[PDB]
Amino acid sequence: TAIVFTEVMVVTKYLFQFGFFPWNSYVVLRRYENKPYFPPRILGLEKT
Amino acid sequence: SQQFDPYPLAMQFISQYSPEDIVTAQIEGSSGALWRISPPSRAQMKQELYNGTADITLRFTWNFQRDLAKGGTVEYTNEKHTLELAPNSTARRQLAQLLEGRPDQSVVIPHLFPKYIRAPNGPEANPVKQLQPDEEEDYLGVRIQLRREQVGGTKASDFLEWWVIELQDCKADCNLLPMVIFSD
Amino acid sequence: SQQFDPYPLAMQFISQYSPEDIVTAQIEGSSGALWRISPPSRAQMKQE
Amino acid sequence: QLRREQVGGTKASDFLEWWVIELQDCKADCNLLPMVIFSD
Numbered sequence A: 001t002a003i004v005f006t007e008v009m010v011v012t013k014y015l016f017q018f019g020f021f022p023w024n025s026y027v028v029l030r031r032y033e034n035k036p037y038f039p040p041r042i043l044g045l046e047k048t
Numbered sequence B: 001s002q003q004f005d006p007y008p009l010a011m012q013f014i015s016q017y018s019p020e021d022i023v024t025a026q027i028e029g030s031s032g033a034l035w036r037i038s039p040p041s042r043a044q045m046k047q048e049l050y051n052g053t054a055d056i057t058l059r060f061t062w063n064f065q066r067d068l069a070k071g072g073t074v075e076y077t078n079e080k081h082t083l084e085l086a087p088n089s090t091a092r093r094q095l096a097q098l099l100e101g102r103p104d105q106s107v108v109i110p111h112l113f114p115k116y117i118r119a120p121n122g123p124e125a126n127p128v129k130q131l132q133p134d135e136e137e138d139y140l141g142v143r144i145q146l147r148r149e150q151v152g153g154t155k156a157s158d159f160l161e162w163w164v165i166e167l168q169d170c171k172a173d174c175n176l177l178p179m180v181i182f183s184d
Numbered sequence C: 001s002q003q004f005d006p007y008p009l010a011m012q013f014i015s016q017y018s019p020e021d022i023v024t025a026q027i028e029g030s031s032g033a034l035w036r037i038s039p040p041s042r043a044q045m046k047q048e
Numbered sequence D: 001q002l003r004r005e006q007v008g009g010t011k012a013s014d015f016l017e018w019w020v021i022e023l024q025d026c027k028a029d030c031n032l033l034p035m036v037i038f039s040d
């Protein structure tokens, strides 16, 4: 379960990373720069 | 923020301040009062502005008064921007021409109006160093002009004078100068 | 005090202060200075 | 109230203006406005 979970996590982060998703617009990201409760940041799917 | 988004230092500075903590001062340009100067002192102004040898200074001073009931000790925050005028330079000669009574002459002083100012809890309202990195080329230019109004006889003292300044590059709010200030 | 004697709140307030602690400011009405306004701004005043 | 004083031509700018205010119900000190202030 550890190996499967880490594999799934890396792939999911990679998929979300793409900029086409609305969360990532360079405006939403900039204003939500250090707010800890941005939904992607809490779920770990935020792109950096 | 969108306007200053590419720049990193500017972006961090603006991010530091809350939106309800920055104010725009819509200082009027043309809505001034009569210029009151004794005729001897005005004549001396014009003569020294023409045939002067020492450089003449020209200062633009801002002064913010903040409410003292909200705590804080210092109640006025002021600072000046000083611009020199070397003898026989184009600007000084232009002003000496301006006082002559021309109907539609105008002068342009480059880099005199710092648009972004900071008002700390101390008596130093320094222009933001960051939003204007050049610190001398990022200052806006100002177009100065003198308006006459006949009354009525001595020639130069015969009629009312006042001064109208406007921003160098103005399209529709030419009668208004904005001034954005960040207060800690 | 005699003028504001019937009123209770006013009477207590005035009683609170010493006689040498209240001052009357005889601000002059007519002794002003010339009204200085640029003719364009006065015309705009009247029109607005 | 507004007071004028001719000097001397443009019409409205032709002469001096100043403003005189007085209390609404004034009998003999019409040229004076009292203002009582209590200082702690």
Ligand SMILES: CCCCCCCCCCCCCCCCC[C@@H](O)O[C@H](CO[C@H](O)CCCCCCCCCCCCCCC)COP(=O)(O)OCC[N+](C)(C)C
Pocket: A001, A004, A005, A008, A009, A012
């Ligand atoms: C962001 C949120 C993500 C949520 C994801 C939830 C996933 C939680 C559980 C993680 C996966 C479950 C793993 C449980 C495994 C238990 C059984 C396991 O022991 O069987 C293994 C067998 O496991 C299989 O081999 C692989 C299983 C792969 C399961 C993939 C699950 C994918 C789930 C994707 C969920 C995505 C959710 C996305 C939400 C947005 C035995 O391996 P073994 O026999 O010794 O291997 C020999 C190798 N040989 C043959 C080469 C010698």
